[PDB]
Design a protein around this nucleic acid. Structure first.
Ligand SMILES: Nc1ncnc2c1ncn2[C@@H]1O[C@H](COP(=O)(O)OP(=O)(O)O)[C@@H](O)[C@H]1O
Ligand SMILES: Nc1ncnc2c1ncn2[C@@H]1O[C@H](COP(=O)(O)OP(=O)(O)O)[C@@H](O)[C@H]1O
Ligand code: ALF
Ligand code: ALF
Ligand SMILES: [K+]
Ligand SMILES: [Mg+2]
Ligand SMILES: [Mg+2]
Lengths: 436, 436
DNA sequence: GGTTTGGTTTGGTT
């Protein structure tokens, strides 16, 4: 039951020889739902990828990293150590050579280096080094007014600025070779039954301070988090930890502590999960790693059923199956920048071994992007720090009734990237063409 | 090793249990050098703080603000919204509870609200409301004839006046509960090898008119700032900007401009650095914010190595390390007084986002307090405005030949605070105890 | 009619 604008985007995308399209629009316009119809249309022919585990599951695909086997680190431009082509008789080479279209959801969260590595990997594997993405038609979907890519500090941030001039997908050099045809969606599907709330979100997207003041007097209820069926969103992992502790201590089960093993240089701020992870039976959790056997993936929500030494059972929300979780290793990578040479080099400096589990009554705004949630409580904590973060938090629910805030938000807290503004204005013509 | 007067003050402070000491004396008597011996003596047990970034680095500690996590605004007396004890499991709580000695350098620049907030924060965290500083032994070092605390206009100035009677650290109500034992240093160490210049500085300290005339005859040389290896000191940031612009335009590198983003009420006189910051490779700079990763600090001097869109690399003077600088956000706080509540309230009215860098061939006198410099040129500009400003500028170097002035100084320019005079007189007795 | 003080957070894993 697609809408007039969705069916229009579908026809414009599926029924043209042009290899590079972008379907963009505000949160909840039905971009991912249009992606399902694209999956039904081509459907060996397509490969659906997303930047995050949560967005990957929402779109019924897998992460860009796990498909291409990219390392969890900076992907230097067309570097052979970072972008390694698959084996001569491997299933990955077979899928890449047989590929016809590639559907990339939540493209706003795809960092420039990741998009460039997808281009080069398809070119090297397909031996079509002259044409963008190896001749694969790319169907990109997302919203640059939602969360910007994650850029850590140090030499990695400097390399991105020097190579592309910024981290956004639209800053990739491939857009000099091919043009991006932009198809836009405007009608709110997620809040289609609350048109007043939809219009308030539309004004908040444009940074309207009157909208913000109205949001405050309508949604500020500090006790909204303690209500049933409510997911708490927070900017930082550490704040979700404190909120998840309260709900953990209220469970009647015996608790079991999972102690991590940390080696070399690994800072506690960098831990994917708690070093002393306490869990109880019945706890809401989210999984952080893909199962090597394929039973669970990064982003899978579920509930603890059994707690044992170095092993626990989780009942998945996605399919109601029972999966057993064992410890995984995480590498900490640091970038050195040799002085005599013009080059940057990665090096592993420490490891973290722990069960890939995190309590999931409270989650970061990053883990929520793409989801339609029944009820959300935003805990501001020490404040908003990423562009698009507040917008993502507020647009997850269908009705204004389903949303609550821990405290009022000031207009000075709203972040805006000028690169996004110039992009959003140039694509109003319908084409994104890069300069140089 | 220490001089005999430094050794007497070292023993006086370390062999008595008395919890509050002040080591004071003229510029360059070796207060901070004695502080180093105190760090060696105490030394898991001591935390070293200072009000400014440059003074913190010289003392090998950190700012008071960064340690206690105080906001960069007026700290209302024992106000819960301004003075927030750390969380139950925070590393800062562990540090405060384990702390035995707090060493506070450049205490003369510590504003009364800052000192009081330290006292209250220590009482609250350690849960000893009845002991000054929660039972921590405090060792203060500084000089009240050097720069007075910074007090911007408006309601913030009126609040300090009403609450404490003025801005100085010695006007803190904590001194009504514990006596401050005073230890004096007299021998110049910085100017040890130039005894006539040390004698001139001493007479300038006492406002001697004949000393000022002797200084004007020897030191006035307008072209002194162009001589190699010279740091220029100016009273105002905008005066330093103009002097920095001249030296920068002589570097051969290609310029790069960092454009600040300003939103809401901000005005240019409050900008921490230029809105249109021009940089070149090789430019001498000072960093204005602490790295969240800990590689660099507010006050760190260095030189530009790389210049990219939103990122630069600076080579630190302090350790020869290369650090990557990204934009930071600053807030503007105004205090509104409300009808018939005798209370003020803070509010964020604007933000300024910019790379935390300033050109550093010319610096403000405030940024020089605590340093020993090889060669100084004081550009008077529009004139002296703060108590102690001229004295700090003149006492940075070891020898008279190392100092030059842009123009002669008239006696009507010398500033004096009566609050300082009554304090300097009472501490001749060896004790300071606030009455009433 | 001026000067000082403050965190880089979040995602990807064969
Ligand atoms: N044409 C449609 N008719 C009815 N419901 C829709 C339609 N398109 C999307 N939805 C619903 O709206 C919600 C948000 O859609 P989604 O595709 O997740 O939006 P986006 O990807 O743009 O955020 C989902 O619950 C989805 O089922
Ligand atoms: N006892 C000493 N012997 C030799 N040099 C000293 C001694 N005390 C201080 N200095 C040097 O004299 C200069 C000023 O000392 P410093 O401790 O910074 O003074 P203050 O903190 O009193 O302004 C510094 O270069 C310091 O190394
Ligand atoms: F744009 Al969405 F969930 F995919 F708001
Ligand atoms: F008193 Al100083 F450098 F700390 F002159
Ligand atoms: K010790
Ligand atoms: Mg979606
Ligand atoms: Mg000193």
């Amino acid at each position: 039951g697609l809408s007039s604008e969705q069916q229009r985007a579908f026809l414009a995308v599926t029924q043209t020889p042009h290899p590079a399209h972008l379907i963009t629009g505000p949160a909840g316009t039905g971009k991912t739902t249009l992606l399902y119809a694209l999956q039904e249309f081509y459907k060996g022919r397509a490969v659906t990828l997303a930047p995050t585990g949560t967005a990957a599951l929402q779109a019924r695909g897998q992460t860009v990293h796990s498909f291409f086997r990219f390392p969890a680190r900076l992907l230097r431009y067309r570097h052979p150590e970072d972008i390694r082509p698959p084996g001569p008789h491997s299933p990955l080479r077979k899928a890449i050579e047989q590929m016809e279209v590639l559907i990339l959801d939540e493209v706003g969260m795809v960092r420039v280096d990741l998009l460039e590595a997808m281009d080069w990997a398809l070119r090297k594997t397909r031996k079509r080094l002259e044409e963008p993405f190896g001749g694969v038609k790319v169907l990109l979907l997302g919203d640059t007014r939602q969360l910007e890519p994650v850029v850590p500090g140090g030499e990695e941030a400097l390399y991105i600025a020097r190579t592309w001039g910024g981290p956004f997908f639209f800053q990739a050099h491939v857009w000099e070779e091919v043009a991006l045809r932009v198809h836009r969606l405007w009608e709110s599907q997620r809040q289609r039954e609350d048109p007043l709330f939809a219009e308030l979100l539309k004004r908040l997207r444009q940074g309207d301070p009157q909208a913000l003041e109205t949001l405050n007097r309508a949604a500020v209820r500090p006790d909204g988090g303690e209500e049933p069926g409510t997911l708490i969103l927070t900017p930082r992992r550490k704040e979700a930890d404190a909120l998840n502790l309260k709900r953990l201590e209220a469970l009647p089960g015996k608790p079991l502590e999972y102690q991590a093993q940390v080696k070399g240089e690994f800072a506690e701020t960098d831990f994917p999960t708690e070093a002393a992870l306490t869990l109880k039976k019945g706890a809401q959790v989210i999984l952080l790693r893909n199962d090597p056997l394929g039973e669970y993936f990064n982003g899978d929500l579920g509930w603890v059923e059994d707690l044992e030494a170095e092993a626990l059972a989780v009942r998945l929300k996605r399919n109601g199956r029972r999966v057993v979780i064992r410890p995984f290793v995480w590498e900490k990578i640091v970038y050195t920048y040799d002085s005599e040479r013009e080059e940057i080099k990665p090096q592993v400096v420490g490891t973290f071994r722990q069960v890939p589990v995190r309590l999931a009554w409270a989650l970061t705004v990053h883990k929520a992007q793409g989801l339609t949630l029944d009820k959300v409580h935003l805990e501001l904590g020490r404040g908003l720090f990423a562009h698009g973060q507040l917008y993502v938090a507020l647009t997850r629910v269908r009705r204004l009734q389903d949303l609550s805030l821990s405290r009022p938000i000031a207009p000075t807290e709203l972040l805006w990237r000028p690169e996004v503004e110039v992009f959003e204005t140039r694509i109003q013509e319908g084409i994104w063409q890069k300069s140089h």
